[PDB]
């Protein structure tokens, strides 16, 4: 004969941003170079 | 396969646990899509649902997790994005 009045209520959650991503590239950029450190012509005595 | 882990919000138990299940799965499976669902699916038995995987060479992405259920990593050139949320 006893009703009796209850209210219940459950914990809440936290949750969080995130992010992913492959791995990066970058340019580069390079020039050979053409040095000529050459005389015309050494008079040797090998 | 060799494993480098470059974030995670989850416990060091399921971080191994990760990483020795995607290992498995790169042994097992040869296309990221199946790969993937092995992995999402051996979580959502053991740890509840909902989980999401990602395994790929080539991409980026943002997402909302569950807090200490997330990890990102490697295995060699593929990386495998895993997390709870739902």
Redesign the interface.
């Given at each position: 004969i006893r009703w009796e009045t209850k209210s219940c209520q459950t914990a809440s959650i936290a949750t969080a941003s995130a992010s992913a991503q492959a791995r990066n590239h970058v340019d580069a950029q390079v020039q050979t170079e053409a040095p000529v450190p050459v005389s015309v012509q050494p008079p040797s005595q090998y | 396969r060799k494993a480098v882990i470059k974030?995670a919000?989850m416990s060091e138990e399921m971080q191994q646990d990760s990483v020795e299940c995607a290992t498995q799965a790169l042994e097992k499976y040869n296309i990221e899509k199946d790969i993937a669902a092995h992995i999402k699916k051996e979580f959502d038995k053991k740890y509840n649902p909902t989980w999401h995987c990602?395994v790929?060479?080539?991409?980026?992405?943002?997402?909302?997790?569950?807090?200490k259920h997330?990890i990102?990593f490697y295995l060699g050139?593929v990386?495998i994005?895993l997390?709870k949320?739902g």
């Open positions: - | 974030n919000d990602i790929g060479r080539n991409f980026g992405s943002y997402v909302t997790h569950e807090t997330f990102y050139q990386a994005l997390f949320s």
